[PDB]
Amino acid sequence: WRCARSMHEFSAKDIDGHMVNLDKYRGFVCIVTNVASQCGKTEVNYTQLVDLHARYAECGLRILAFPCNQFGKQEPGSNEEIKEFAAGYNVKFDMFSKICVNGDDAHPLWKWMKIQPKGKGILGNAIKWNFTKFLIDKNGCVVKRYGPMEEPLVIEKDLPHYF
Template identity: 45%
Template sequence: MQDAKGNDVSLSFYKGKVVLIVNVASKCGMTNSNYTELNDLYRKYKDQGLEVLAFPCNQFGDEEPGNNEEIADFVCTRFKSEFPIFDKTGKWGIFGDDIQWNFGKFLVNKHGQVVDRYYPTTSPLSIEYDIKKLLGTS
């Protein structure tokens, strides 16, 4: 994969970590709450092995119209996010065609297996228990 700056990133870097993959958008009605809660989770659990990977996508309602630089600036300036922002994905990109809307979430265990999928309307904080369980801190 490539990050928002165009650097190649091997997903093997995240081996042994619990990963929350999220398709994100800057102009969605769920943007503020999701980024705020994702930041809370990341700050709370990053030192215990949680990674949040944000994949901007414009396939739903054109709610992520910016380029990678604009997206990263928005996320880092407005929300002070520290988790990785990846290259903007196009329609039928990494998520395939069965994603309902922005902020679909996929929880991946330390072995790289997707163990749960959450709807866009699912609050990131509501899955904290699942994250803690995979981290071994519950």
């Protein structure tokens, strides 16, 4: 994974258990984010992500949400329960099966994103908490990273430069 050159070289199981080849996102600007149902910022992140997708899907914005239980055990539920939880926020973007984002068992896409030049956060490579966001350009390269404290709407400053 270390020498992969694009998010499009990876695959991941979606929240229904179906393996997805991420080269389907070639030509689309993507937000990749680790999510959780029981986080103090769950509501702000889900609602603003849904708002961004509603406003920009016509522009080519796609959103990939990876549930993760590594931060305060705040995603303890099953994939089926998390799918129903996201439905409650009217999520129409792409939900994936629960993964790890840190450590040796982290999904290889996340290992790769964290070492990209724009994938290093202001506080370093490790994912620090729920709802870190990566902006991915149409070629599958990481172009921005946003921390758990940065609400999704801050990403609006960067989107028009990559569509």
